[PDB]
Amino acid sequence: ASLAPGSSRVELFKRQSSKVPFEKDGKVTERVVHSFRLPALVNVDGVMVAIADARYETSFDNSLIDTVAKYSVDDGETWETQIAIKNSRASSVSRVVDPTVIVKGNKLYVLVGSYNSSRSYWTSHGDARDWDILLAVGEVTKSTAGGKITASIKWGSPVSLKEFFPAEMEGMHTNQFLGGAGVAIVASNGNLVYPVQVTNKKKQVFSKIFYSEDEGKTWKFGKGRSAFGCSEPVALEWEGKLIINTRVDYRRRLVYESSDMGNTWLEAVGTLSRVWGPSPKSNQPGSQSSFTAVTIEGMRVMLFTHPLNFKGRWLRDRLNLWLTDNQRIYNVGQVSIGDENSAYSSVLYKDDKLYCLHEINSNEVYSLVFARLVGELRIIKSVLQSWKNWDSHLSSICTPAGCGPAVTTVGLVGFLSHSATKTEWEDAYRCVNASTANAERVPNGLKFAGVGGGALWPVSQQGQNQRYHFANHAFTLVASVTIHEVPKGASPLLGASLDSSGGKKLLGLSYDKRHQWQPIYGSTPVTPTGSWEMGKRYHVVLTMANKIGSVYIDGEPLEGSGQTVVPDERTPDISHFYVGGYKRSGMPTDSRVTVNNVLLYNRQLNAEEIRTLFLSQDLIGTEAHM
Numbered sequence: 001a002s003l004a005p006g007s008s009r010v011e012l013f014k015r016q017s018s019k020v021p022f023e024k025d026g027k028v029t030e031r032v033v034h035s036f037r038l039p040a041l042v043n044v045d046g047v048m049v050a051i052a053d054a055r056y057e058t059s060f061d062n063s064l065i066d067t068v069a070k071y072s073v074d075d076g077e078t079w080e081t082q083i084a085i086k087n088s089r090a091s092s093v094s095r096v097v098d099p100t101v102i103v104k105g106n107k108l109y110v111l112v113g114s115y116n117s118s119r120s121y122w123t124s125h126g127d128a129r130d131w132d133i134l135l136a137v138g139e140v141t142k143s144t145a146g147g148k149i150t151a152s153i154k155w156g157s158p159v160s161l162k163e164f165f166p167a168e169m170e171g172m173h174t175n176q177f178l179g180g181a182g183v184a185i186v187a188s189n190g191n192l193v194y195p196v197q198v199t200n201k202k203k204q205v206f207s208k209i210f211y212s213e214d215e216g217k218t219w220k221f222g223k224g225r226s227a228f229g230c231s232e233p234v235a236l237e238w239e240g241k242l243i244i245n246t247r248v249d250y251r252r253r254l255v256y257e258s259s260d261m262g263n264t265w266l267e268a269v270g271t272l273s274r275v276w277g278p279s280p281k282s283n284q285p286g287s288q289s290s291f292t293a294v295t296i297e298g299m300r301v302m303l304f305t306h307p308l309n310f311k312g313r314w315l316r317d318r319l320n321l322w323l324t325d326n327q328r329i330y331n332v333g334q335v336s337i338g339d340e341n342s343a344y345s346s347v348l349y350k351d352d353k354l355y356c357l358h359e360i361n362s363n364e365v366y367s368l369v370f371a372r373l374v375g376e377l378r379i380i381k382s383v384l385q386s387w388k389n390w391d392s393h394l395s396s397i398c399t400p401a402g403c404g405p406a407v408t409t410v411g412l413v414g415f416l417s418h419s420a421t422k423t424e425w426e427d428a429y430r431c432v433n434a435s436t437a438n439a440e441r442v443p444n445g446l447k448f449a450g451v452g453g454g455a456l457w458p459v460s461q462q463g464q465n466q467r468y469h470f471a472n473h474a475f476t477l478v479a480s481v482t483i484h485e486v487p488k489g490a491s492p493l494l495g496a497s498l499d500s501s502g503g504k505k506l507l508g509l510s511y512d513k514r515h516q517w518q519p520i521y522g523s524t525p526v527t528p529t530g531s532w533e534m535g536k537r538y539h540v541v542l543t544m545a546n547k548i549g550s551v552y553i554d555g556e557p558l559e560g561s562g563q564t565v566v567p568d569e570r571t572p573d574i575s576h577f578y579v580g581g582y583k584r585s586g587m588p589t590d591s592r593v594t595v596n597n598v599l600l601y602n603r604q605l606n607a608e609e610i611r612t613l614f615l616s617q618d619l620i621g622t623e624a625h626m
């Protein structure tokens with residue numbers, strides 16, 4: 001893929017070409033840089049600022065590095081270059097590393113680890129003999145040169161914050177810590193907040209919250225932490241909580257939420273945790289990620305980037321952009337070009353303009369290109385228009401009492417309704433479509449029939465990035481159904497499957513030749529219950545929360561519903577939801593049924609919300625508006 005139409009870029013920090021003002025021995029010389037890495041792009045009072053690593057001689061992490069900075073007043077049309085922080089010059093490999101930036105006022109708060117002579121990766125160090133943690137502040141000043149506007153950043157001498165690092169943390173002895181790289185934040189209470197990666201004497205890595213209530217003079221660590229294995233954390237604030245997105249090498253990315261500045265950390269199992277995989281099989285090294293909360297056209301949202309890493313190891317090709325409102329998760333597309341190597345990145349939203357500063361690597365020689373995400377922001381605005389519209393549409397429906405409670409759109413992730421192509425049932429939220437077989441389009445839905453007939457809404461089948469991972473912890477699946485033929489035995493209607501066939505179910509609804517419902521609770525022996533008549537329309541709700549599954553028909557629980565569907569302590573790994581058959585020609589069954597308006601929620605709905613959905617089933621369809 002490549003940049004969306006209308007978008008373009010330029011190699012801003014050009015490898016082995018761009019020069020910087022390297023200072024040594026009171027002298028200063030324009031020195032060429034082999035590699036530029038660790039991109040951090042921010043907006044300071046109108047000034048666009050780009051911070052990064054200046055790796056003078058090699059791209060090897062443990063070499064000579066200073067923190068470079070280029071700034072613009074014309075939004076990337078022209079840039080001034082400087083060195084924001086120079087390393088100790090103690091050896092040929094002295095360096096200030098992984099700059100992490102926070103903008104507050106006309107101030108740049110830059111946190112970097114500092115090493116003097118070690119040629120070993122920081123996480124392999126057994127002690128802090130070679131380490132320090134420094135904070136440098138750059139103050140921005142705008143003015144006018146030849147009639148036109150100009151600016152200048154004055155950089156302060158870095159200050160050691162090592163005095164704020166406790167020798168002990170709950171059950172361990174501290175070693176070193178660094179910022180999470182990229183861009184950090186100012187909390188809504190004013191606090192400077194840096195998600196930091198810390199090591200202990202057992203050489204384990206884990207993330208913590210390192211914050212300041214006094215503009216940067218003193219610092220504290222939240223009492224809590226992530227699990228071990230969580231590095232380069234990146235955080236944002238969302239609805240009064242910090243959402244900390246972590247890199248986990250060779251594993252799916254863990255995401256945590258903290259309401260108390262890091263004293264307690266809860267994994268975001270019902271929203272973003274384990275959604276993003278570091279590679280197709282999530283068995284390769286991860287990456288630093290841009291993760292920010294922006295307000296586009298009135299709507300608060302989060303932007304996330306990470307490479308797909310098809311190539312493997314650290315190559316990390318295909319830098320992708322994601323959009324989420326903490327409910328739906330949309331893949332905006334690929335920001336890097338073709339299959340170039342593009343790991344670390346930084347996305348900025350400034351004056352309704354979207355930009356990205358990210359790495360491009362060829363033979364371990366890095367450059368930072370500066371891209372104008374024009375087509376991308378177009379797509380983003382459009383998708384948000386779609387979410388706002390469908391939410392407004394559903395919320396404005398006057399439900400049967402003059403009106404009863406409004407249809408709930410809180411936690412509504414996907415909706416399969418009128419729109420369907422020959423092979424796909426389309427998500428009105430435009431994030432995840434369902435694949436189909438033997439389906440005939442009908443108002444607000446599809447009519448199925450035949451061995452192999454049905455629809456498949458992927459969960460673990462989505463692949464590397466699993467937007468419906470939350471379903472393994474809780475969900476509500478809703479649908480209107482009509483059975484056209486009494487089955488020979490027991491046929492599937494709606495369900496959450498644990499395997500690819502649909503034979504190993506988590507929670508499901510089947511119907512049998514004796515006109516009874518067959519709710520399936522995990523691998524528990526089935527017991528038919530209730531009755532139905534052929535050709536009659538029914539309303540079905542499947543919910544799961546607290547390892548318990550329930551099945552409702554026409555708004556009411558079936559007898560004996562509410563059983564444990566998650567047997568032990570291992571978390572489910574739902575493969576997909578099946579609707580109107582298994583969509584597997586390999587399953588014998590034949591479901592002749594019509595299913596309309598399938599809704600997917602990331603929580604268990606309550607009795608009233610279930611009641612309103614039932615009464616309102618003929619009002620929610622997308623049909624009239626396409």
Ligand SMILES: *[C@]1(C(=O)O)O[C@@H]([C@H](O)[C@H](O)CNC(=O)c2ccccc2)[C@H](NC(C)=O)[C@@H](O)[C@H]1F
Nearest residue numbers: 038061097098121122123178231232286287343
């Ligand atoms: C990124 C990167 O992946 O490109 O990595 C971090 C850091 O090195 C990484 O989180 C940890 N490294 C390893 O686990 C490892 C390194 C080498 C060989 C095997 C394992 C860099 N930051 C630091 C402080 O090293 C960052 O600059 C960048 F290289």
Ligand SMILES: [Cl-]
Nearest residue numbers: 173200201202
């Ligand atoms: Cl320890």
